[PDB]
Design a protein around this motif. Structure first.
Motif, PDB file in Angstrom:
ATOM      1  N   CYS A 132       0.863  -1.215   0.000  1.00 13.93           N
ATOM      2  CA  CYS A 132       0.000   0.000   0.000  1.00 13.93           C
ATOM      3  C   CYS A 132       0.890   1.252   0.000  1.00 13.93           C
ATOM      4  O   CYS A 132       1.667   1.429   0.963  1.00 13.93           O
ATOM      5  CB  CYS A 132      -0.938   0.012   1.202  1.00 13.93           C
ATOM      6  N   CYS A 135      -0.216   3.337   3.549  1.00 18.30           N
ATOM      7  CA  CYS A 135       0.072   2.826   4.923  1.00 18.30           C
ATOM      8  C   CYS A 135       1.257   1.844   4.934  1.00 18.30           C
ATOM      9  O   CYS A 135       1.643   1.405   6.041  1.00 18.30           O
ATOM     10  CB  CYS A 135      -1.170   2.197   5.553  1.00 18.30           C
ATOM     11  N   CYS A 157      -6.012  -1.102  -0.778  1.00 19.02           N
ATOM     12  CA  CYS A 157      -5.715  -1.465   0.621  1.00 19.02           C
ATOM     13  C   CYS A 157      -7.022  -1.720   1.380  1.00 19.02           C
ATOM     14  O   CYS A 157      -7.966  -0.921   1.209  1.00 19.02           O
ATOM     15  CB  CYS A 157      -4.942  -0.340   1.283  1.00 19.02           C
ATOM     16  N   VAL A 159      -7.044  -2.256   4.827  1.00 13.45           N
ATOM     17  CA  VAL A 159      -6.690  -2.053   6.268  1.00 13.45           C
ATOM     18  C   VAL A 159      -7.870  -1.358   6.961  1.00 13.45           C
ATOM     19  O   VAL A 159      -8.328  -0.321   6.431  1.00 13.45           O
ATOM     20  CB  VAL A 159      -5.375  -1.264   6.436  1.00 13.45           C
ATOM     21  N   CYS A 161      -8.509   2.232   4.300  1.00 14.23           N
ATOM     22  CA  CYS A 161      -7.359   2.968   3.705  1.00 14.23           C
ATOM     23  C   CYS A 161      -7.565   3.171   2.198  1.00 14.23           C
ATOM     24  O   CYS A 161      -7.199   4.252   1.687  1.00 14.23           O
ATOM     25  CB  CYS A 161      -6.056   2.218   3.961  1.00 14.23           C
TER      26      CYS A 161
END
Ligand SMILES: Nc1ncnc2c1ncn2[C@@H]1O[C@H](COP(=O)(O)OP(=O)(O)OC[C@H]2O[C@H](O)[C@H](O)[C@@H]2O)[C@@H](O)[C@H]1O
Ligand SMILES: CC(=O)Nc1ccsc1C(=O)O
Ligand SMILES: [Cl-]
Ligand SMILES: [Cl-]
Ligand SMILES: [Zn+2]
Length: 282
Positions: A132, A135, A157, A159, A161
């Motif tokens: 990513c 992040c 992503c 997460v 995100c």
């Protein structure tokens, strides 16, 4: 890219005669037993026996390109099995005889073998790994991420995100990941033994890392069928198939090469397993 220095390609193979080979792999076993901190350095030559061509060997990708020919793959990256050498490196970490693994290979085989990622530097990236941009979260995929050269993959992503996921495969101009390089450099400096397996050691700074072990009196073993950039610097040079070397070495260390359970990702190294008592050396 077109003009990129691809180095010395297609140098002649060297084969240590059996008696000399037997003597050198025993000496290697002596060095592993004496060594507090053992760092392994792997390149394309450790994946040739699973059907992945190397780069600068006689049928290397770059060698074949120079002679107008094509390298040949006997597997996909997805159907590639970790070699005896890959599985011997998993056991050595498990029993506490390998401090750190530095690899230039993008084939994903170390990760897929079950080797713990916190003891692995993947200096040139990993074909199964996307990262990513936001992040920095890494994903290890069951198929090769479709892109190379730190390009957008098309996935986002997840997460807890929606960041852009990109491949981890360095192009010629891209500098090495700072985390992997910092940890490869720290392990190499602190090593009292670096062992190189199937790398011609021609790429800076990857190829130079084993030399950092020579600082403060470390020992350097080079296992390679061809000459390598740093042959002159090695306390021991073993010319033979890395699988023959690692299987004779494991036998000397009284260790089994573990079974491969198929593709499995291990983020974090476990506490050391038991290992055989050390021989009387002197
Ligand atoms: N079974 C084997 N046993 C022992 N040595 C072997 C075997 N098979 C091959 N070799 C040797 O293994 C050596 C492999 O050398 P190279 O092909 O340069 O690979 P690298 O990992 O160092 O390439 C570095 C980067 O260069 C690229 O641009 C990429 O970015 C790479 O990541 C040869 O000298 C073979 O004789
Ligand atoms: C030897 C090797 O890793 N080659 C490779 C890596 C990504 S694409 C590719 C190829 O030979 O096409
Ligand atoms: Cl390529
Ligand atoms: Cl590329
Ligand atoms: Zn993210």
């Amino acid at each position: 890219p077109f003009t990129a220095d691809k180095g010395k390609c297609g140098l002649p193979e060297i084969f240590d005669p059996p008696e000399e080979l037997e003597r050198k792999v025993w000496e290697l076993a002596r060095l592993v037993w004496q060594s507090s901190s053992v760092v392994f350095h792997t390149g394309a030559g450790i994946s040739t026996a699973s059907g992945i061509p190397d780069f600068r060997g006689p049928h290397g990708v770059w060698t074949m390109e120079e002679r107008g020919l094509a390298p040949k793959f006997d597997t996909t990256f997805e159907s590639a099995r970790p070699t005896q050498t890959h599985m011997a490196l998993v056991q050595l970490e498990r029993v506490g005889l390998l401090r750190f693994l530095v690899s230039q290979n993008v084939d994903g085989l170390h990760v897929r073998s079950g080797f713990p990622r916190d003891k692995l530097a993947e200096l040139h990236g990993n074909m199964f790994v996307e990262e990513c941009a936001k992040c920095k979260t890494q994903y290890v995929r069951d198929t090769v991420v479709g892109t190379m050269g730190l390009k957008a993959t098309g996935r986002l992503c997840t997460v807890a995100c929606r960041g852009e996921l990109r491949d981890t495969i360095l192009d010629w101009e891209d500098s090495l990941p700072d985390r992997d390089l910092a940890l490869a450099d720290e392990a190499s400096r602190n090593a009292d033994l670096s062992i190189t397996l199937g790398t011609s050691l021609q790429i800076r700074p990857s190829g130079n890392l084993p030399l950092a072990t020579k600082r403060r009196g470390g020992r350097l073993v080079i296992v390679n069928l061809q000459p390598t950039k740093h042959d002159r610097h090695a306390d021991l040079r073993i010319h033979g198939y890395v699988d023959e070397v690692m299987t004779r070495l494991m036998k000397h260390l009284g260790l089994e090469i573990p079974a491969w359970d198929g593709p499995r990702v291990l983020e974090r190294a476990l506490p050391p397993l038991p290992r055989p008592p050390t021989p009387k050396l002197e």
